[PDB]
């Protein structure tokens, strides 16, 4: 029984994190990578 | 003018004057306006 219960145990340890990543989809800074390369897809207008 | 922000300038070009060499000025009046995206035109 106990055998079983570690088990479980460890199932539920990569629930949760599994759970908390899912989460939090987009990272802050990856957020920020992201948005940087979005700036500089822009701005075609100036150096025109 | 017309709701959306433009300004004028006028620059200084050197040109020398023609039997006599002489530094001389030709001015000229220039205009921009400001684009939707923030880029002046």
């Known amino acids: 029984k106990t055998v079983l219960e570690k088990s479980k145990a460890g199932a539920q340890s ?34 025109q | 003018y017309k709701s959306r922000l433009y300004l004028l300038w006028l620059e200084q070009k050197e040109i020398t004057k023609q039997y006599q060499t002489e530094t001389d000025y030709r001015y000229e009046l220039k205009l921009a306006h400001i684009r939707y995206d923030g880029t002046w035109n």
Do not use: P
């Open chain 1, 14 to 47: 990569r629930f949760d994190s599994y759970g908390k990543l899912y989460d939090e989809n987009i990272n802050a800074g990856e957020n920020q990578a992201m948005t940087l390369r979005a700036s500089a897809a822009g701005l075609t207008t100036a150096v």
